[PDB]
Design a protein around this ligand. Structure first.
Ligand SMILES: [Mg+2]
Ligand SMILES: [Mg+2]
Ligand SMILES: [Mg+2]
Ligand SMILES: [Mg+2]
Ligand SMILES: [Mg+2]
Ligand SMILES: [Mg+2]
Ligand SMILES: [Mg+2]
Ligand SMILES: [Mg+2]
Ligand SMILES: [Mg+2]
Ligand SMILES: [Mg+2]
Ligand SMILES: [Mg+2]
Ligand SMILES: [Mg+2]
Ligand SMILES: [Mg+2]
Ligand SMILES: [Mg+2]
Ligand SMILES: [Mg+2]
Ligand SMILES: [Mg+2]
Ligand SMILES: [Mg+2]
Ligand SMILES: [Mg+2]
Ligand SMILES: [Mg+2]
Ligand SMILES: [Mg+2]
Ligand SMILES: [Mg+2]
Ligand SMILES: [Mg+2]
Ligand SMILES: [Mg+2]
Ligand SMILES: [Mg+2]
Ligand SMILES: [Mg+2]
Ligand SMILES: [Mg+2]
Ligand SMILES: [Mg+2]
Ligand SMILES: [Mg+2]
Ligand SMILES: [Mg+2]
Ligand SMILES: [Mg+2]
Ligand SMILES: [Mg+2]
Ligand SMILES: [Mg+2]
Ligand SMILES: [Mg+2]
Ligand SMILES: [Mg+2]
Ligand SMILES: [Mg+2]
Ligand SMILES: [Mg+2]
Ligand SMILES: [Mg+2]
Ligand SMILES: [Mg+2]
Ligand SMILES: [Mg+2]
Ligand SMILES: [Mg+2]
Ligand SMILES: [Mg+2]
Ligand SMILES: [Mg+2]
Ligand SMILES: [Mg+2]
Ligand SMILES: [Mg+2]
Ligand SMILES: [Mg+2]
Ligand SMILES: [Mg+2]
Ligand SMILES: [Mg+2]
Ligand SMILES: [Mg+2]
Ligand SMILES: [Mg+2]
Ligand SMILES: [Mg+2]
Ligand SMILES: [Mg+2]
Ligand SMILES: [Mg+2]
Ligand SMILES: [Mg+2]
Ligand SMILES: [Mg+2]
Ligand SMILES: [Mg+2]
Ligand SMILES: [Mg+2]
Ligand SMILES: [Mg+2]
Ligand SMILES: [Mg+2]
Ligand SMILES: [Mg+2]
Ligand SMILES: [Mg+2]
Ligand SMILES: [Mg+2]
Lengths: 595, 70, 118, 188, 263
RNA sequence: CCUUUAACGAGGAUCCAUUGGAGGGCAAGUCUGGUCGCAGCAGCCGCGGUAAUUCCAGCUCCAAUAGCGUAUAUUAAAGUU
RNA sequence: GACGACCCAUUCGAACGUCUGCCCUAUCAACUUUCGAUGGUAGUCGCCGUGCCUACCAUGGUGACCACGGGUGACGGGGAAUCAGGGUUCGAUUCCGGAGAGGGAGCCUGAGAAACGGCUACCACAUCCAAGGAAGGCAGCAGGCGCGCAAAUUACCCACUC
RNA sequence: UACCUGGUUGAUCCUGCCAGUAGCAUAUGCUUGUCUCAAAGAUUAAGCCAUGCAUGUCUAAGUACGCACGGCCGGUACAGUGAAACUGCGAAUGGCUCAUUAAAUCAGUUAUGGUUCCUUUGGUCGCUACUUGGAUAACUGUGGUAAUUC
C-alpha cells in the first residue's frame, strides 16, 4: 500500500573495500532488471528510484550503514474524510485544533487547504468520501469516536463555540456586500475592538475612504479588520498576506496575534516568506498531488515544521518528494549581447490627481533592451502610473504615449470568459509556438493540462493568473504592463513564472515594467529600479530609476526592515527590527548581502 | 527469497491453475507443508507451500471470493 | 549573560552554581546547575552597565535627581518602630504605626497598616 | 496494569477421543432424539458432570471408613444428589453412586419436566415454550431449557401470569387478526 | 524500585481475617503506623462500613470520624485507618454503645458489645522489664504503653488490668500453671483454656499446652499465650460460644437443628 | 449496555448457516457429465496411460455446528528414555 | 488545643548473616595468590560484623559427592497445560522478591536515592540558531516510524478502591 | 475411559519407525444472529520517538499594608475574603519492562547479644525577659540577549 524505496546517502560509501554486497543480491538484479548501478569504482553506488520492490534485502547485508528505507507517497484510500465531489480530489484526515495558540498550515497551491478550512468551520459537513448517501451527524460522531473530533464537532453543533472565517479572494466581497463608508464597520459588531483594530491596521482613513475607493490590499485589511471584530470563538485566515506592505504583513501578524489569549481556536494558512514564525506556534505540513489528493501531517513546532517543509523534505515518520532547497536562485548565470541600437523612451515629471493622490514624477531614462523593476508601499499609486500610460488621464500635460504595443495585466482578477477559457484562447492562438517559453512556464505543478479545458469561474486563481500571463505574453505587444504577478501563487511557481518571463523576453532585448511587493522575483529581475517615497493619503514621489542597491536601500530604510541570508539554503529572513544585527545593518545601511 | 533472513527457498503452489495468479517479483507468505521438516508426497525436496500472494488468499483468489488488487 | 562578583577575567566562563550563589535560582531543594557568566572586568564588549550614584555634585541632572522620593512602606516589627521614633521602653508602640493612605476611583478612601508582630 | 477483575473460568465438556466411532454416534444420536437437545455438546456436558461426581465418589470409597473427611463429604454429596431427584433416600450410601446413569441427569431438566408434567404436546414443543417465556417456577419466570429442577420445586412449574396460555392479553398475532375484522373487514 | 518505605497495600495481599471481597478495586486500606502490628490490627475504616454498616463509602467514614464521635481507649481518634487491635475498646458516644476487640473462635475479630460500666479498663500483656535512669523500673505492654514505677512482682508474660484515664495498673494476673488463657496466634486462634503446662527449650521458642472445657488440648508457642483470668473465671466478658472451636461435623448439626435460615 | 415497558415487526422464493470430506485408516456414493500418466489429488498406502468409487463439476450423503480448516511449539499415545 | 524538640521504647521497614535447595556442557581436569587468593595480630573506613582496605606474618582454600571455565530464545517463586500410578513441558505477563530508565561513571538534598518526570562529565544519537549560544531522554498513558508470521483510541472522569 | 489403527511380504511371525488420533497456545483462512464475562506491541529491535497529559499541597491554629474584592469607621496586636510570594511537607510510594544475573537472584528456616529508622502510639520535659539582631521575596521602577520554567 505505501510505496517503500531504498536510498544510499552515507558517510563514505566504500565501493573499494566492501566488495559490493549491495548489488550482489538485490532480488531484481538476479532476474535481469538492474536495480543498482555499481562495480569496483570510486564513488556512490547509484540506485533506481523505482526498480527496488521495497524488498529491504538491499539493507540487511551492507557491512557499513549505507542503505535505508523511505516511504514514497501513494493514494491509500485510508482516512478519506472527503472528496471535492465524486471522482475528484481526495482529502485525508484533519489537524486537531489546539486551543490557546495559533495553528498554521503550509503546502503547495491546491492540496486541500481551503476544503479543510471549510470543513473545520462546519460550513462543509464530512461525507466520509462517499459519492452517494452523505451521512448526517450520527455516523459522523461515530467515525471518530475515541478521538478529539468526537467532542469538537458537538461543541460546534450546539454552537457553544460558533465559528467565523475569512474568505480566500479579495476581489469578491466589495461586489457581494453593500455598505457606505465607516457605518458598516460601526454597525457590524462593536466600537471598542473596532477602535483598536482600525488604528493598529492603519485604516483610520476609511471613516471617509469608501468601500468603492479602497484597493485589494486595503480590502484584505478591511476583511481582516471585520473578521477580527466579529464576535466568535474560533477563527481562520485564508491567505492573510495576499497583496500587503512588507511592514504591514507583520502588522497584520501582530493584530491577529493580539487575540491569542482567551481560549480561542485559530487556524491560518499562508504562502509565507518570513511572516508566519511570528504568527503561528505549531505547524502542520501538507503533502500529496495537486487537485488529485492531499494528506495532512501531525503537529510540529514553528522552526521544526518550517524546516521539515524545506530543510530537506522528510517528516520524522515518512517521506514526500517536493519543496527542496531553492528559495533563492543560486544559479548566478546571466549572459546576452550588448547592442548600440538603444531607444531611450523618456517621459516628463508630470503631476497628477484623482481626488486625493498627489503622486509626483521625475524623469527616467527608460530603455528597450532590459526590464526595469518598481518598488513602493501599498496604496502609493504604483498602479495608476502604467494605467495612465495605458491610454488614461494626463497624456496631455506631458505623459509619453506608448511607443510600442501594450500588453496589459490587470491586478483585479475577473476575466469575462463564460463557458470555458478555450474560447478566450481564440482571441489569441497557441500555434505561434510549441516551445520552452510556453512549456516550462505553464506546466510545472502538473502539466499545461488543467488550464486548457475548464470554466474560468471554478478556477484556482493561480492557474487563471498563469493564463492571464499567457494571454499577456500571447497578445500582439512589446511594452508589457504588470501588477503583482506573483500574487495567488506558491513559492516555487512564483519563481518559475518570474525566471521564465525574464529569460523569455530577454531573448528579444525587450520592454517590461514589473510591479512587485515581494523579494525573490524582485531581486532576480533587476539591474535598475524606481522607488516610491512618502506616506499615502497626501503625497508620493516616484524617484528616478536608480541602481538596485541604493534604490532598495531608499526602500527599506523608509520601511525600516533589514534582511539576513542564511548560507546553507540562501534563505531570507527578517531581523527583528531591533537586534545586535539590526544595529550594524542599520548603521551601514546594508540590507542586501551576497550580491 | 525470504525478507528477514534473505535466504532462498522453494515453495509449492497448492491447487489447479493457481500458478497464473503469481506475478513475478511480488511478495508471498509461505507456510509449512505438514511433516515438520521433510518433503511431502511425490515432490523431490520441496518443504513449503504458499497461502497468500499479495495480502489476498489463494483459497479466495481461486474460489472467486476476491480478485487481485490490480 | 550577566556578570557576578569575584570571577576575575574579561572573558566568559562556565561555573557550577547552587543555592546562595547569584545569577541562579534553583528549581528544587538541593540542586545545582552549570551555566555561563561573564567575568567582573569592564570592557567595550558589553551592552549595558548598571551604575549607582554614591556622591552627587552640585548641578542637578535634568531628569534623574529633581524628582521626589515616594512614601515607600512602613515598619511592622515592634522594635523597628521603637528605633525609628526613638520611643522609650514604655511609650505605646501602637498609635505611631504608619497608617498607609489609600485612594481609588471606586469606593470611599481608606487607611491601612500592618499587623504589628513582636 | 493491576485491575479489579476475575479471570477465573473453566470448560464444561470434553470431546471424545475416537472421533468417528459408530457405537458412539448412534447412542448419542438416540439421546439427542429422545430428549430434544441441540448439539452433541449438550450431551457431553451431562457426561462431564457425571464423570466428575464419579471421581469424588471413588476417591471417598478408597478412604477408610469412620474417617472425618470421608464422613463429612459423603454425607454432603449424597444430600446434594438426593436433593435433585437422582438418588433414592432408600439408598443413601456411596457404593450406590457408582450405579447412576447419564439418563437421570437428563431426566431432571426443565424441558423434560414441562413435557412429562403435561404442559406441552411433545419434548420439542416444551423446548419452544420455555424459550418463549411461557413458564414460571415459583413466582419467577424462567427462560433456560437446561435448568435442573430441585426435588421440592417439582410441583411449582405452571404457565406464566403474563402470557396468553392462562390469564394474559392475546399475542401480537391473535390481535392483528381480530383487528382485521374491525380494520380490514369493517371499513377495510 | 524500592528505595524507601511503601505506602500502598494491594487487596489480595491484605490480611485474610479482614474478610475483604475481591472485585471492588485493586487496593486495601493499608493501616497507618501505630501500636498494633500490620497483620494483627483492624483499621477503623474496616470496622464502620464492613461490620457495623454505619457508613457506605470511604468518604462517609471520613465524615463520620471528623465529627469527633469515635473514641479508641478514651482518646478521640480522627484517623480513619488507625490500627485498632486485640484489647482495644471503641466507644461511640452519640449512640451510647461500646465494643471490645476479641477474636471469635474461627480466628477473626467480631463485634462484641459490652456494658458501659466495663469499658473503663482493659488488659495488657507484659513484654519487657527494665530499670531506667536513676533506678526507676519500667514496663512495656503489647500495645506500646510504658508504665513507670510498677509493682516489683509483675514480670514478663503476665497480664495487667489498667484504667483508661490514668494508666496506673490496678490488678495483675501471673503466668503459671492453672490460669485461664486465650490464644492469639497461628492455628489455634481465639481458643480458651487452662494453661496446664509449659516446656522450655533454651534459646528457641518455648512451647505451651492448653486444655479446653471439653478435654481438647492444643499446644502453642509461649509468645502467643495471653492470660485473661485467674483461673476458670475470665475477668473480661466473652463472645458467644467462648472459644470452644467445635468441629465441622458439629457446626453442621447446629446449623440444621436451629434451621437458622431466616429470622 | 443488559434487565422493565407502550407502538410497529414472520409464511419460508425469506427475518436464507457455514467449514471440510465421501478407496482404506475413518462416519458417508462400485450416480451422472468432463479430462486422458495431462491438469491435478494425496499427512501415510496410493489415484490419473479414452470405461477415474480418489482429479474438475452437478446431484445426493457424511461430521461438528455459530463455528470449522491449515502452519508451527508442546503434552498423552511412547513399556519408542 | 495546633506546632516544634532531646533521648528511650513501639510501629513501618531496611541492612548484613546461618542451614538446605538449580537447566545443559569433559570437544572445560585442575583452579586460586601482593594486580587479596585462605588465615592471624594492630589499625583505616563504615550505620554496625567482616581482607571491606592498608602494614607486618604464616601458606593456605576449592575438586571425580564435577571445582574452575563455557552456553542458556535463563529474571526466581506463588503457579499453568497434559496427566491410571510415576512423570514431561511451560512460568516476559495483574500477587510477592530482584534489577534497569540509550551505554558506563560521579554526586547534591534528605530519615530514606548512588534517584534519572534530579544534577554533572565522557560515548552514541537528535533538535533550535542571528553561528555567539541553548536545549534532550515515552522499557508511565494515548499516538507515530521501524521491525516482523505476530498485538486496540492522540476519548471520558475523580463518582467507586486507595 | 489404565484403548490403539494404516504402512516392508507371493503370503506369515517379529524388531522398528513414519502416518493417523485427542488436548493445549501463537499465527492465519473461510463464515458470523443474540447475551454474560474478558486477553491484547512479551517473542523481532532494553530500537528510535512529533504533540498533549501522567505530582502536587491551607487550616480556628507559620508569614497578609496587592484596592483584587470588601463593612458602617475604627486596625487603637488586627476584621473579613484572599491572588502572589517566603516557609513546611511530598516528590524514594505508585506505573512500565525483563536487558543483566546459575550458590547469584529467589524460597522455606533462623540471628542481630553486630546496626539505622521520617511518621504514628506511650514515656521523658527545673542546672531586653511585659520579649533581642540584620536581610531578603512578592510589590514599585530601569533593563540585556534571536532564543529557555534565563
Ligand atoms: Mg544578539
Ligand atoms: Mg476601605
Ligand atoms: Mg507573632
Ligand atoms: Mg516501585
Ligand atoms: Mg533505580
Ligand atoms: Mg494509611
Ligand atoms: Mg459442501
Ligand atoms: Mg477432496
Ligand atoms: Mg465428487
Ligand atoms: Mg478416507
Ligand atoms: Mg465406512
Ligand atoms: Mg473420451
Ligand atoms: Mg469417463
Ligand atoms: Mg466417470
Ligand atoms: Mg510425549
Ligand atoms: Mg585480621
Ligand atoms: Mg579488625
Ligand atoms: Mg596451592
Ligand atoms: Mg590442596
Ligand atoms: Mg561456573
Ligand atoms: Mg524460567
Ligand atoms: Mg535474558
Ligand atoms: Mg497428576
Ligand atoms: Mg514470572
Ligand atoms: Mg525476552
Ligand atoms: Mg506487557
Ligand atoms: Mg513486580
Ligand atoms: Mg525478603
Ligand atoms: Mg529506548
Ligand atoms: Mg525529607
Ligand atoms: Mg542514575
Ligand atoms: Mg521514577
Ligand atoms: Mg532535568
Ligand atoms: Mg544535559
Ligand atoms: Mg520518561
Ligand atoms: Mg507507550
Ligand atoms: Mg507490515
Ligand atoms: Mg493476535
Ligand atoms: Mg503491526
Ligand atoms: Mg478518589
Ligand atoms: Mg524387507
Ligand atoms: Mg505387496
Ligand atoms: Mg505423529
Ligand atoms: Mg478438532
Ligand atoms: Mg464490560
Ligand atoms: Mg492468555
Ligand atoms: Mg520490545
Ligand atoms: Mg514530549
Ligand atoms: Mg485563611
Ligand atoms: Mg487572617
Ligand atoms: Mg515551595
Ligand atoms: Mg521529604
Ligand atoms: Mg503496555
Ligand atoms: Mg544488573
Ligand atoms: Mg556459570
Ligand atoms: Mg556465566
Ligand atoms: Mg546460599
Ligand atoms: Mg524470606
Ligand atoms: Mg535467605
Ligand atoms: Mg509527615
Ligand atoms: Mg512523642
Amino acid at each position: 500500500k505505501l510505496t517503500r524505496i531504498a536510498i544510499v546517502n552515507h558517510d563514505k560509501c566504500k565501493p573499494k573495500k566492501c566488495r559490493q554486497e549491495c548489488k550482489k543480491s538485490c532480488p531484481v538484479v538476479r532476474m535481469g532488471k538492474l536495480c543498482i548501478e555499481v562495480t569496483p569504482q570510486s564513488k556512490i553506488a547509484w540506485i533506481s528510484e523505482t526498480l527496488c520492490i521495497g524488498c529491504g534485502i538491499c539493507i540487511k547485508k551492507c557491512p557499513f550503514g549505507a542503505l535505508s528505507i523511505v516511504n514514497l507517497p501513494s493514494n491509500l484510500e485510508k482516512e478519506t474524510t472527503h472528496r471535492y465531489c465524486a471522482n475528484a480530489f481526495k482529502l485525508h484526515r484533519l489537524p486537531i485544533p489546539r486551543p490557546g495558540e495559533v495553528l498554521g498550515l503550509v503546502g503547495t497551491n491546491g492540496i486541500g487547504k481551503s476544503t479543510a478550512l471549510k470543513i473545520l468551520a462546519g460550513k462543509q459537513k464530512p461525507n466520509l468520501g462517499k459519492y452517494d448517501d452523505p451521512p448526517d451527524w450520527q455516523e459522523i460522531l461515530t467515525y471518530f469516536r475515541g478521538s478529539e473530533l468526537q467532542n469538537y464537532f458537538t461543541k460546534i453543533l450546539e454552537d457553544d463555540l460558533k465559528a467565523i472565517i475569512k474568505p480566500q479572494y479579495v476581489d469578491q466581497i466589495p461586489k457581494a456586500a453593500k455598505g457606505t463608508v465607516g457605518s458598516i464597520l460601526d454597525r457590524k459588531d462593536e466600537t471598542k475592538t473596532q477602535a483598536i483594530v482600525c488604528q493598529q491596521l492603519d485604516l483610520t482613513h476609511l471613516k471617509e475612504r469608501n468601500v468603492e475607493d479602497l484597493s485589494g490590499g486595503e480590502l484584505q485589511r478591511f476583511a481582516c479588520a471585520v473578521v477580527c471584530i466579529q464576535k466568535a470563538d474560533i477563527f481562520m485566515f485564508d491567505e492573510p498576506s495576499s497583496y500587503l506592505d512588507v511592514k504591514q504583513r507583520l502588522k497584520a501578524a501582530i493584530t491577529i496575534r493580539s487575540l491569542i489569549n482567551p481560549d480561542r481556536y485559530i487556524i491560518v494558512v499562508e504562502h509565507d516568506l518570513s511572516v508566519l514564525d511570528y504568527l503561528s506556534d505549531f505547524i502542520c505540513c501538507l503533502y500529496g498531488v495537486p487537485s488529485a489528493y492531499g494528506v495532512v501531517t501531525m503537529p510540529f513546532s514553528v522552526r521544526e515544521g518550517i524546516n521539515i517543509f524545506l530543510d530537506g523534505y522528510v517528516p520524522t515518520e515518512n517521506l514526500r518528494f517536493r519543496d527542496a532547497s531553492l528559495v533563492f536562485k543560486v544559479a548566478e548565470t546571466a549572459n546576452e549581447e550588448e547592442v548600440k541600437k538603444m531607444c531611450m523612451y523618456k517621459y516628463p515629471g508630470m503631476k497628477k490627481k484623482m481626488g486625493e493622490f498627489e503622486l509626483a514624477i521625475v524623469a527616467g531614462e527608460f530603455t528597450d533592451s532590459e526590464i526595469m523593476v518598481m518598488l513602493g508601499e501599498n496604496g502609493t499609486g504604483k498602479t495608476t502610473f502604467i494605467r495612465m500610460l495605458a491610454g488614461r488621464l494626463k497624456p496631455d500635460e506631458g505623459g509619453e504615449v506608448p511607443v510600442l504595443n501594450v500588453s496589459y495585466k490587470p491586478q483585479k482578477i475577473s476575466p469575462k470568459s463564460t463557458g470555458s477559457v478555450r474560447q478566450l484562447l481564440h482571441e489569441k492562438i497557441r500555434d505561434a509556438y510549441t516551445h520552452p517559453q510556453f512549456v516550462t512556464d505553464v506546466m510545472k505543478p502538473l502539466q499545461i493540462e488543467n488550464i486548457i479545458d475548464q470554466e474560468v469561474q471554478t478556477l484556482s486563481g493561480g492557474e487563471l493568473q498563469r493564463v492571464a500571463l499567457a494571454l499577456c505574453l500571447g497578445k500582439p505587444a512589446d511594452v508589457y504592463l504588470i501588477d503583482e504577478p506573483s500574487a495567488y501563487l506558491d513559492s516555487e511557481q512564483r519563481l518559475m513564472a518570474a525566471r521564465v518571463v525574464k529569460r523569455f523576453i530577454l531573448h528579444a532585448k525587450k520592454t517590461a515594467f514589473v510591479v512587485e511587493h515581494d523579494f525573490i522575483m524582485a531581486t532576480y529581475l533587476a539591474d535598475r529600479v524606481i522607488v516610491f517615497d512618502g506616506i499615502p493619503s497626501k503625497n508620493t514621489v516616484a524617484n528616478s530609476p536608480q541602481t538596485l542597491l541604493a534604490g532598495m536601500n531608499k526602500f527599506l530604510s523608509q520601511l525600516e526592515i533589514t534582511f539576513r541570508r542564511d548560507p546553507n539554503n540562501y534563505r531570507p529572513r527578517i531581523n527583528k527590527l531591533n537586534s545586535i544585527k539590526d544595529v550594524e545593518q542599520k548603521k551601514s545601511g546594508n540590507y542586501f548581502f551576497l550580491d | 527469497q525470504l525478507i528477514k533472513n534473505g535466504k532462498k527457498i522453494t515453495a509449492f503452489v497448492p491447487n489447479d491453475g493457481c500458478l497464473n495468479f503469481i506475478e513475478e517479483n511480488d511478495e508471498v507468505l509461505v507456510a509449512g507443508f505438514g511433516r515438520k521438516g521433510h518433503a511431502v508426497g511425490d515432490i523431490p525436496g520441496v518443504r513449503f507451500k504458499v497461502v497468500k500472494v499479495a495480502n489476498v488468499s489463494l483459497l479466495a483468489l481461486y474460489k472467486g471470493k476476491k480478485e487481485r488488487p490490480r | 549573560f550577566p556578570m557576578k562578583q569575584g570571577v576575575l577575567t574579561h572573558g566568559r566562563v562556565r561555573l557550577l552554581l547552587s543555592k546562595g550563589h547569584s545569577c541562579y535560582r534553583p528549581r528544587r531543594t538541593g540542586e545545582r546547575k552549570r551555566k555561563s557568566v561573564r567575568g567582573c572586568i569592564v570592557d567595550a564588549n558589553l551592552s549595558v552597565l548598571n551604575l549607582v550614584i554614591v556622591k552627587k555634585g552640585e548641578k542637578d541632572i535634568p531628569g534623574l535627581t529633581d524628582t521626589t522620593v515616594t512614601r515607600r512602606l512602613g515598619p511592622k516589627r515592634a522594635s523597628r518602630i521603637r528605633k525609628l521614633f526613638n520611643l522609650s521602653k514604655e511609650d505605646d508602640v501602637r498609635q505611631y504605626v504608619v497608617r498607609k493612605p489609600l485612594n481609588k476611583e471606586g469606593k470611599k478612601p481608606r487607611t491601612k497598616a500592618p499587623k504589628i508582630q513582636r | 496494569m493491576p485491575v479489579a477483575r476475575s479471570w477465573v473460568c473453566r470448560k464444561t465438556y470434553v470431546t471424545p477421543r475416537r472421533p468417528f466411532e459408530k457405537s458412539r454416534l448412534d447412542q448419542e444420536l438416540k439421546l439427542i432424539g429422545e430428549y430434544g437437545l441441540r448439539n452433541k455438546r449438550e450431551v457431553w456436558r451431562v457426561k462431564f458432570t457425571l464423570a466428575k461426581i464419579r471421581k469424588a465418589a471413588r476417591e471417598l470409597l478408597t478412604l477408610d471408613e469412620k474417617d472425618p473427611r470421608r464422613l463429612f463429604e459423603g454425607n454432603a454429596l449424597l444430600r446434594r444428589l438426593v436433593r435433585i431427584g437422582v438418588l433414592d433416600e432408600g439408598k443413601m450410601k456411596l457404593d450406590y453412586i457408582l450405579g447412576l446413569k447419564i439418563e437421570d441427569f437428563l431426566e431432571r431438566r426443565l424441558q423434560t419436566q414441562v413435557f412429562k408434567l403435561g404442559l406441552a404436546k411433545s419434548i420439542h414443543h416444551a423446548r419452544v415454550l420455555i424459550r418463549q417465556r411461557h413458564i414460571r417456577v415459583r413466582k419467577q419466570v424462567v427462560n433456560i431449557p437446561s435448568f435442573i429442577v430441585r426435588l421440592d420445586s417439582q410441583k411449582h412449574i405452571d404457565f406464566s401470569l403474563r402470557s396468553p396460555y392462562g390469564g394474559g392479553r392475546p399475542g401480537r398475532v391473535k390481535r392483528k387478526n381480530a383487528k382485521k375484522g374491525q380494520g380490514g373487514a369493517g371499513a377495510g | 524500585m524500592a528505595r524507601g518505605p511503601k505506602k500502598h497495600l494491594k487487596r489480595v495481599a491484605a490480611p485474610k481475617h479482614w474478610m475483604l471481597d475481591k472485585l471492588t478495586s485493586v487496593f486495601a486500606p493499608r493501616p497507618s503506623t501505630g501500636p498494633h502490628k500490620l497483620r494483627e490490627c483492624l483499621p477503623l475504616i474496616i470496622f464502620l462500613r464492613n461490620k457495623l454498616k454505619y457508613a457506605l463509602t470511604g468518604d462517609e467514614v471520613k465524615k463520620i470520624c471528623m465529627q469527633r464521635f469515635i473514641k479508641i481507649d478514651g482518646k478521640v481518634r480522627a484517623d480513619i485507618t488507625y490500627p485498632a487491635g486485640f484489647m482495644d475498646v471503641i466507644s461511640i458516644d452519640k449512640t451510647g454503645e461500646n465494643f471490645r476487640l476479641i477474636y471469635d473462635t474461627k480466628g477473626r475479630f467480631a463485634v462484641h458489645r459490652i456494658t458501659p460500666e466495663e469499658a473503663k479498663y482493659k488488659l495488657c500483656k507484659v513484654r519487657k522489664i527494665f530499670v531506667g535512669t536513676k533506678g526507676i523500673p519500667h514496663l512495656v505492654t503489647h500495645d506500646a504503653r510504658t508504665i513507670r514505677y510498677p509493682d516489683p512482682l509483675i514480670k514478663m508474660n503476665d497480664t495487667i488490668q489498667i484504667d483508661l484515664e490514668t494508666g496506673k495498673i490496678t490488678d495483675f494476673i501471673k503466668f503459671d500453671t492453672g490460669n485461664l488463657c486465650m490464644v492469639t496466634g497461628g492455628a489455634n486462634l481465639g481458643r480458651i483454656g487452662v494453661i496446664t503446662n509449659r516446656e522450655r527449650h533454651p534459646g528457641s521458642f518455648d512451647v505451651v499446652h492448653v486444655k479446653d472445657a471439653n478435654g481438647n488440648s492444643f499446644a502453642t508457642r509461649l509468645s502467643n499465650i495471653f492470660v485473661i483470668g485467674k483461673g476458670n473465671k475470665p475477668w473480661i466478658s466473652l463472645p458467644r460460644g467462648k472459644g470452644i472451636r467445635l468441629t465441622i461435623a458439629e457446626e453442621r448439626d447446629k446449623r440444621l437443628a436451629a434451621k437458622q435460615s431466616s429470622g
